[PDB]
Structures are given as C-alpha cells and as structure tokens.
C-alpha cells in the first residue's frame, strides 16, 4: 500500500518565507506563520483565506494551536511569544522573558501551559491564563530547535543544536532522560509519537530517527531526503496508512512507510526548501510550506 497525495491547492499571500503550518485539532483550519511577521488562517478543506493576524514586530518561527482550537501561540524573533484569540484575531497575552529569538512553541493537552524554546538556550514553561513564566529550564548549551508535550502533558521533549534530546518532567522541571549520540550532529526537530512511547528526532545529517527514549534504543531510521541547514518539522501521519512525513532542502515532501522505512512518495511542486509540513487530524491531507523563493503553502490529498 502506498499513498497517492495529489496537489489540491496552492495558497499565496505571505510576503516572505513561510516558517510553519499547523492544522487546528478540530480540522477546520490551517494556520501559517511567516518571516513576514504575520499569521494567516485558511480553510482546511477549500483552501479559502480566512484572515490575517498581526502584531509581532519581527518574523515568526513557529505557531501552535490550543487543544480546543480556540487559541494560537506564536514565537517570534522579537524575543516574545503571543497568545491570540483566533476568532477575534486579538492578542490576548505577550509572553516576555526570553533573551533571544523564540524558535519553537506548543500548548500542553490541557492547554493551561505553553512550552517554548529559544536561541537563549533555555526552555520556558508559561501559565496560559496569566501569561506569567512559571519555569526557566537551563535545558541546553546551544539554540533549542523544538519543544513538545506528550499525550497527557506530564513530559516535555526538547532538542538543540548542541546535539541532545532531553525528556523533562513538566511538574518538577527535572530532566528525566538525555539521549546522547556519538558524532552528535545538531538536532533540528523532535516530537513525541502519538502514543507517547517514542520520539521522532531529526538531525542535520539528513537523517530522521525513531527512538525508544525510555530504552534509549533507536528503532527506525529514515533517509533519502536532504536536511543539512534548516529545522524542518516532521510528522506522524495516522489517518490512513502509517507514514512519516517531512519537508526537504531539495524542495520535495518525503513520505516514508513508518514500519519498513521505505520511501512511499515524494511530492513535487515547491520551488524552495519545504520548511514545514502538517498532517490533518481526520482526513488524509498534508499541508506543506516553503522558504523565500516560493513563499506558498500547498495542500495535498490522498485516498490512503
């Protein structure tokens, strides 16, 4: 079995490189963040532009949805995060305290916490309702590329240019686990598997790895794409066949069989580094987005 993703829409309108795309948990919306300092909301099924959300003074590197699809959190080069009420577009909070670029962000499943990582080498845990920083973790010795909560919000995984992935206890803020590899290439992305038992980690040696973090064992590797320069996010695709999905610096979307590690499809049509991909939570739909030469978002659909 192989997927047959086909281009359905190309969404133009960001005036600089796109940095991330995320589907709302309820499946209704796609959100995109850009170096052009904007967030844009699009209809997930018809591609229709919904609205522009603005207020960051510098470009945005990441955006994330609350579990109830009502809020967005964005991370900016202006060293802040912002919490936005989606239906109004109003900024609800500005999260202040990082001393350098904010690179990555996520809500916990309860959506009372936001986790963030920054070029200042720290991971911060923020109270959503007050906007107050609850904890500053001295997580890494170089910029933090990714932060992600597990299924119940009791753990955080972080990754850094320093070459490490770390598993943190959310309530105590203590490091429970450090994944150390020889040759320690920079880690450009990490996230928990849907069941929270594994982590998917990208390194800037053109390599994705599926790890048992409790066992400290690497179960799968995925290769064939190009990832040497940029923090490209990867996804678990679970609505049809079980795939691994990632952008690539050769302008393609790559799709691997999760179990066999074979490449099952390559999506062509972007004209620059595909910096971000996202998988729709209920339909076999992929959103992809690209850097300065392209600046577009593409929606793809498959029967499996």
């Amino acid at each position: 079995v192989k997927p047959n993703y086909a281009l359905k829409f190309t969404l133009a309108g960001h005036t600089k490189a796109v940095s991330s795309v995320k589907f709302s948990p309820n499946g209704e919306w796609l959100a995109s963040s850009s170096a052009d300092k904007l967030i844009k909301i699009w209809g997930a099924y018809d591609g229709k532009f919904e609205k522009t959300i603005s207020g960051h003074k510098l470009g945005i590197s990441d955006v994330a949805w609350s579990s109830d699809s009502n809020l967005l959190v964005s991370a900016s080069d202006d060293k802040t995060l912002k919490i936005w009420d989606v239906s109004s577009g109003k900024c609800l909070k500005t999260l202040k305290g990082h001393s350098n670029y904010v690179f990555c962000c996520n809500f916990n499943p309860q959506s009372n916490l936001i986790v963030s990582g920054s070029f200042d080498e720290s991971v911060r845990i923020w109270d959503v309702k007050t906007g107050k920083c609850l904890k500053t973790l001295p997580a890494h010795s170089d910029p933090v590329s990714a932060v992600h909560f597990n299924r119940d919000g009791s753990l955080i995984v972080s990754s850094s240019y320093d070459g490490l992935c770390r598993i943190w206890d959310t309530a105590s803020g203590q490091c429970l686990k450090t994944l150390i590899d020889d040759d320690n290439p920079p880690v450009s992305f990490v996230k928990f598997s849907p069941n929270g038992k594994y982590i998917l980690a990208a390194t800037l040696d053109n390599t994705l790895k599926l790890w048992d973090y409790s066992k400290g064992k690497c179960l799968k590797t995925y290769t064939g794409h190009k990832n040497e320069k940029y923090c490209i996010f990867a996804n678990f695709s679970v609505t049809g066949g079980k795939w691994i999905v990632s952008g690539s610096e050769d302008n393609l979307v790559y799709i691997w069989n999760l179990q066999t590690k074979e490449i099952v499809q390559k999506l062509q049509g972007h004209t620059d580094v595909v910096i971000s991909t996202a998988c729709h939570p209920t339909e076999n739909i992929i959103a992809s987005a690209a850097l300065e030469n392209d600046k577009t978002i593409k929606l793809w659909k498959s029967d499996c």
Partner: peptide
C-alpha cells in the same frame, strides 16, 4: 526574517 527561515546555527 525569522530564525526558522535562516540556517540553524548559533
């Protein structure tokens, strides 16, 4: 720009 859209390095 944004740091995500630039090469990843300190």
């Amino acid at each position: 720009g944004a740091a995500k859209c630039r090469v990843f390095s300190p």
